[PDB]
Amino acid sequence: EDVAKMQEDLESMHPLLEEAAKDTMLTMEQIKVDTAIAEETRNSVQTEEIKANEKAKKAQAIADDAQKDLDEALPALDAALASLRNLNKNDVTEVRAMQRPPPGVKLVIEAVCIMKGIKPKKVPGEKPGTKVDDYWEPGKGLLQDPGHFLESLFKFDKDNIGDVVIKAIQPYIDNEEFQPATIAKVSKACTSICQWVRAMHKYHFVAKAVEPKRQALLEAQDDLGVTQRILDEAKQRLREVEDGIATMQAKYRECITKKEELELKCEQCEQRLGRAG
């Protein structure tokens, strides 16, 4: 009885030994295939890492060039805006009271009124009738409050400079008397106002030639972010395959220790076969 039994235990365990052996080999080749793919994803990741490093060098090259165009006008503005802080309450009050403003001051009070978008006052001209507009009287109101004047210059902030107001003041810029070095012989407050206007004019003109650049800088960052998401989706996979390998590396080891146990069991049932014979 016992002999037959043992004999079938050994026969039945033989297929279990053959089954564990395919499983360990199956495991084996599976680690080999994920290792090769984990490597393919590693070169794929290294090529995207150079792809996002160049797209950042290119995005920065656009920002430096676009920033170069912007300090083409930015120093004059702050210089001028310094000079507007140069002005105390009376410097406005003194120009406002001028009952006979020299032609330099008229020019400057004209220029500002247009920038700030003020309605002129058509007054007699020299040739009879010929109504010419005199911005003086509406300027006076913008100087009635010196505080409210200077703030509204500090709050202009460009952007809202219609293309109308820039051709309206192209004659003033093109004027060789609209130079602050000259206005400085007659009045101080108008020298500050003279360079302010002259400045926001070029600033309006460069800031329109950095619309293309700032948009290329916008599109260059968009490219880096897509290469960035493609990259990070790859490092996620490279991580996931590597943990898959790790999990299978420990399956292989359990596969092995299971074989050893079935082998050890096969040896014993074998050993008391040739014992009982």
Curated annotation (Swiss-Prot):
It comes from Homo sapiens (Human). It is linked to Spermatogenic failure 18: An infertility disorder caused by spermatogenesis defects and characterized by abnormally shaped spermatozoa in the semen of affected individuals. SPGF18 patients present with primary infertility and multiple morphological abnormalities of sperm flagella that result in impaired sperm mobility. Abnormalities include absent, short, coiled, bent, and irregular flagella. SPGF18 inheritance is autosomal recessive. Consists of at least two heavy chains and a number of intermediate and light chains. The chain holds residues 2844 to 3120 of 4265 of the full protein. Residues 231-277 form a coiled coil. Dynein heavy chains probably consist of an N-terminal stem (which binds cargo and interacts with other dynein components), and the head or motor domain. The motor contains six tandemly-linked AAA domains in the head, which form a ring. A stalk-like structure (formed by two of the coiled coil domains) protrudes between AAA 4 and AAA 5 and terminates in a microtubule-binding site. A seventh domain may also contribute to this ring; it is not clear whether the N-terminus or the C-terminus forms this extra domain. Force generating protein of cilia required for sperm flagellum motility. Produces force towards the minus ends of microtubules. Dynein has ATPase activity; the force-producing power stroke is thought to occur on release of ADP. Required in spermatozoa for the formation of the inner dynein arms and biogenesis of the axoneme. It is found in: Cytoplasm, Cytoskeleton, Cilium axoneme; Cell projection, Cilium, Flagellum. Residues 1-269 are annotated as: Stalk. This is Dynein axonemal heavy chain 1. Expressed primarily in trachea and testis, 2 tissues containing axonemal structures. Also expressed in brain. Belongs to the dynein heavy chain family.
